[PDB]
Ligand binder design. Structure first.
Ligand code: SF4
Length: 207
């Protein structure tokens, strides 16, 4: 077995899966991170949302999407008329990957390698098989690539309803921008990008 696969227990119970992920050594990222950050939500959710990895705040909160990026996504979900009872939100990698600077106000997130994404993917498959979502929203390049291939380009397929035969349960897949990209740039570009994120979320909610 490769990566996290022998660390994943034979259960679909999300509490048991989350506990087991706390003991995962499927790649090196568990060493420096505070804790594993599993997904949040319930198995009745119809929409699954996948980001890249927990960030500085999530690493310590023990919860996904608790910082500025989470607040922007919340603003977008509200504008797309998506109830939070319908969501299961998680990340492609479950340990924060980072370095620090000397005068930074945060620990600096680093990009997971394809090896780490592939190593952690067993947790994502377990989450997908446990929740059985009707649609999976892929927030950013790392998450999209995790399920759609290392060559996939979000910018080229944003907001298209995709279906790949290798994904368990054949949910609809919708790739979109990662909310953290929307925190930067000119006001009108952020406003334009925010409306496009809402669009992609509305496509997913209409699956
Ligand atoms: S990032 Fe994923 S595969 Fe790597 S140790 Fe953490 S939970 Fe396991």
């Amino acid at each position: 077995m490769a990566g996290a696969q022998d660390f994943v227990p034979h259960t679909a119970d999300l509490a048991e899966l989350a506990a087991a992920a706390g003991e995962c050594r499927g790649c090196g990222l568990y060493r420096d991170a505070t804790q594993a950050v599993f997904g949040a939500g319930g198995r009745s959710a119809r929409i699954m949302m996948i980001g890249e990895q927990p960030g500085d705040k999530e690493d310590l909160a023990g919860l996904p999407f608790v910082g500025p990026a989470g607040r922007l996504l919340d603003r977008a979900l509200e504008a797309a008329d998506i109830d939070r009872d319908a969501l299961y939100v998680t990340n492609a990698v479950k340990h924060f990957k980072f370095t620090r600077a000397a005068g930074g106000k945060r620990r600096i997130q680093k990009t997971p390698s394809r090896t780490e994404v592939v190593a952690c993917r067993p947790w994502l498959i377990a989450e997908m098989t446990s929740v059985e979502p009707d649609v999976v929203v892929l927030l950013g390049a790392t998450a999209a690539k995790a399920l759609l291939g290392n060559d996939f380009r979000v910018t080229q397929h944003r907001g298209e309803v995709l279906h790949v035969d290798d994904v368990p349960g054949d949910p609809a897949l919708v790739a979109t921008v990662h909310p953290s990209s929307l925190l930067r740039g000119p006001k009108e570009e952020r406003e334009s990008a925010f409306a496009g994120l809402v669009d992609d979320l509305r496509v997913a909610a209409d699956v």
